[PDB]
Amino acid sequence: SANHLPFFFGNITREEAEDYLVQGGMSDGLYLLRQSRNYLGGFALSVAHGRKAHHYTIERELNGTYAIAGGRTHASPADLCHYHSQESDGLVCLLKKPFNRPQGVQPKTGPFEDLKENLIREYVKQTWNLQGQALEQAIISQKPQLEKLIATTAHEKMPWFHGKISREESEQIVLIGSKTNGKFLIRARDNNGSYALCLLHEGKVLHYRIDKDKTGKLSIPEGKKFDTLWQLVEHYSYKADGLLRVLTVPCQKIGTQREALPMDTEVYESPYADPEEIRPKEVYLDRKLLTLEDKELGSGNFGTVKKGYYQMKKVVKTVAVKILKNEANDPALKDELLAEANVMQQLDNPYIVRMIGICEAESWMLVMEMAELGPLNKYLQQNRHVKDKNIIELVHQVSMGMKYLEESNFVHRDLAARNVLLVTQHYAKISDFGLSKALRADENYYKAQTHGKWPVKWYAPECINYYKFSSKSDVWSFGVLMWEAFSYGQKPYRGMKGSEVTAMLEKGERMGCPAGCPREMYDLMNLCWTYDVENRPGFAAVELRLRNYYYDVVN
């Protein structure tokens, strides 16, 4: 633990950390330690330097040691802080003075904080009935939004809320069993916003009154005003204030739309998630069950896309249909195309455009999930109001879908913003994975310009030079895609030619940091753009680095 450290704050936010740093003066080398906001038992170090706050993720190693950016192992957070007081390996400056928790501030750790993870998990399971991987993938992407949502549930279902019990009943419930200091319950004093907070202190029960303001706010006599019992308990679990002590363990109760959340959409789960829905016996879909609309959604190098409708046993599924060119009809391409289509149909993840099946009719047809808001680059160019935090959320879902493709030994080959489609403004899906290989794309597609875009601008050096496509080269493309996202749909390597791009990269030169792009996101782009394939991270490391930054900045 880090609880004994007087400059350790527990699970506070990044902005609360920064507010403490300003409270302490903002002198260079002023620092504090806190908990990583990821349920991974890690830490975060917040440092003042040049009127700015610098945040670093401290991860727990398998052996129980600690390290920053896969670097030097340290025995404990205290040992890590001791080390960085004399040498800064990658840190902005050395650590000179700790900012101790102000008088009256305890670490934001404890039972209330501990319940959050199980509460979010339970909330997903009962709101969306998700299980296994669909459930895990929902929590990973949506943890910040889910944390906000559990804070709005009715206090009546909370373990520390005992309802209409009497003062004598509450006295007896708080006293029973081990007399842990801070053991508490909240009970209703009446139906009109009147409550009692019962707290255990040195074997005695303290009965505090919580009253509702004319303003609808809840507080104890002369104490801070809160909107909910959730906020009240959260604050009192680390700031004693009026109370003789912080709240600790709840007493056991007697007994024992273009803004929708990804899981609020039909496409989040596979159509065949319903056991009543019977999955086709192969990659082949029945042309008789498919109806296409006349108007095109768009087109590209490999074909034209239309909106369609696929008749299933218990519903009409809206689909997007890519009709391959005449070139795809060549008997020489058939086996490779069917082989890749089988592998594409195996992929099941919320953050990919699932390939439902194929139709060999008037032309070859790829039946896919609909992502109606269209491509990421065009959307951002048309909606510059989209916040940096919303962009982090979308690129993080892309990193999740890419980790899944990598785990599945699937190489995308054309990972770019044009191939990231939006279901909602908070829900991105990777499209056209492995299409260029399935269709045996020509040298003129890779080297030259097609539809106003230069595909080589997304290729790792070993792809252009040695034609070696791998999950590591997809990592490179992800860095270019991150740059596109942060540039609100701008084209990469402005006005350059493939020859000019290749030679620039050989020199170790890279694209610049987009306006308003965080330093840590530009550092991630630079890591993806590692020339050497062996030193370049895989998607597991990219997703975790992105996840950690996302959880630290969003709410």
Ligand X SMILES: Nc1ncnc2c1ncn2[C@@H]1O[C@H](COP(=O)(O)OP(=O)(O)NP(=O)(O)O)[C@@H](O)[C@H]1O
Q: Which tokens sit at 33?
A: 């330690």
Smallest distance, Mg ion to C-beta of residue 444, A: 18
d(CA 356, CA 344) in angstroms, rounded, equals 9
Q: Which is nearer to ligand X, 371 or 460 (CB)?
A: 371
Residue 487 is assigned to a ligand binding site:
no
29 binds ligand X (CB under 6 A): no
| Contacted by 356, from ligand X, Mg ion, none: CB < 5 to 8 Å by type | none
Residue 322 is assigned to a ligand binding site:
yes
441 binds ligand X (CB under 6 A): no
| Contacted by 305, from Mg ion, ligand X, none: CB < 5 to 8 Å by type | ligand X
Residue 290 is assigned to a ligand binding site:
no
d(CA 388, CA 465) in angstroms, rounded, equals 34
The residue with its CB nearest to ligand X is: 300
3: CB partners within 8 A, 6+ apart: 107, 109
Smallest distance, Mg ion to C-beta of residue 300, A: 5
Contact residues toward Mg ion (CB under 5 A) are 419, 431-432
Q: Which is nearer to ligand X, 320 or 528 (CB)?
A: 320
Q: Tell me, what amino acid is at 474?
A: D
d(CA 446, CA 380) in angstroms, rounded, equals 25
DSSP 322: E
Smallest distance, ligand X to C-beta of residue 271, A: 13
Instruction: Confirm if 50 and 30 have CB atoms less than 8 A apart.
Output: no
d(CA 270, CA 111) in angstroms, rounded, equals 37
For CA atoms 61, 63, 66, 71, give the dihedral sign.
Answer: negative
Residue 50 is assigned to a ligand binding site:
no
DSSP 535: T
Smallest distance, Mg ion to C-beta of residue 296, A: 14
Q: Which is nearer to Mg ion, 481 or 554 (CB)?
A: 481
Helix (H, G, I), strand (E, B) or coil at 501: helix
Q: Which long-range contacts (CB under 8 A, 24 or more apart) does 113-122 make?
A: 113/10, 113/11, 113/237, 115/159, 116/147, 116/150, 117/39, 119/150, 120/146, 120/147, 120/150
368 binds ligand X (CB under 6 A): yes
| Contacted by 375, from Mg ion, ligand X, none: CB < 5 to 8 Å by type | ligand X
Q: Which tokens sit at 143?
A: 């943890």
d(CA 496, CA 454) in angstroms, rounded, equals 9
Residue 475 is assigned to a ligand binding site:
no
140 binds ligand X (CB under 6 A): no
Site for ligand X in 261-320 (CB under 6 A): 297-303, 305, 320
Q: Which tokens sit at 459?
A: 């290729």
Site for ligand X in 401-430 (CB under 6 A): 414, 418-419, 421
Instruction: Confirm if 481 and 420 have CB atoms less than 8 A apart.
Output: yes
Residue 539 is assigned to a ligand binding site:
no
Q: Which is nearer to ligand X, 234 or 432 (CB)?
A: 432
| Contacted by 381, from ligand X, Mg ion, none: CB < 5 to 8 Å by type | none
DSSP 102: P
Binding mask 330-359 for ligand X (x = CB under 6 A): -----------------------x------
Q: Which is nearer to ligand X, 9 or 310 (CB)?
A: 310
d(CA 114, CA 156) in angstroms, rounded, equals 19
Cα separations in angstroms, 134 against 125, 142, 398: 10, 12, 15
Q: How many helices (H) and strands (E) does the chain have?
A: 16, 16
Smallest distance, ligand X to C-beta of residue 436, A: 8
Residue 303 is assigned to a ligand binding site:
yes
370 binds ligand X (CB under 6 A): yes
- DSSP states along 169-214: HHHHHHHSSS--TT-EEEEEEETTTEEEEEEEETTEEEEEEEEE-T
Candidate ranges 226-234, 364-372, 389-397, 492-500; the one touching ligand X (CB under 6 A)? 364-372
- Of the listed 414, 432, 474, 552, which one is catalytic? 414
d(CA 47, CA 522) in angstroms, rounded, equals 19
Q: Which is nearer to ligand X, 47 or 321 (CB)?
A: 321
Residue 297 is assigned to a ligand binding site:
yes
**Residue of 431, 473, 487, 548 that binds ligand X (CB under 6 A):** 431
Smallest distance, ligand X to C-beta of residue 397, A: 15
451 binds ligand X (CB under 6 A): yes
Residue 401 is assigned to a ligand binding site:
no
| Contacted by 299, from Mg ion, ligand X, none: CB < 5 to 8 Å by type | ligand X
330: CB partners within 8 A, 6+ apart: none
| Contacted by 533, from ligand X, Mg ion, none: CB < 5 to 8 Å by type | none
Q: Which tokens sit at 419?
A: 């191939």
Cα end-to-end distance, the chain, whole Å: 25
Residue 414 catalytic? Answer: yes
Q: Which is nearer to Mg ion, 131 or 382 (CB)?
A: 382
432 binds ligand X (CB under 6 A): yes
Tell me what percent of the chain is helix, strand and coil, each rounded to the nearest 5: 35, 20, 40
Smallest distance, ligand X to C-beta of residue 322, A: 6
Residue 255 is assigned to a ligand binding site:
no
Smallest distance, ligand X to C-beta of residue 356, A: 10
d(CA 478, CA 391) in angstroms, rounded, equals 14
Q: Output the known binding site.
A: 297-305, 322
| Interface ranges with ligand X (CB under 6 A) | 297-303, 305, 320, 353, 368-372, 374-375, 414, 418-419, 421, 431-432, 450-451
Q: Output the known binding site for ATP.
A: 297-305, 322
What are the catalytic residues? Answer: 414
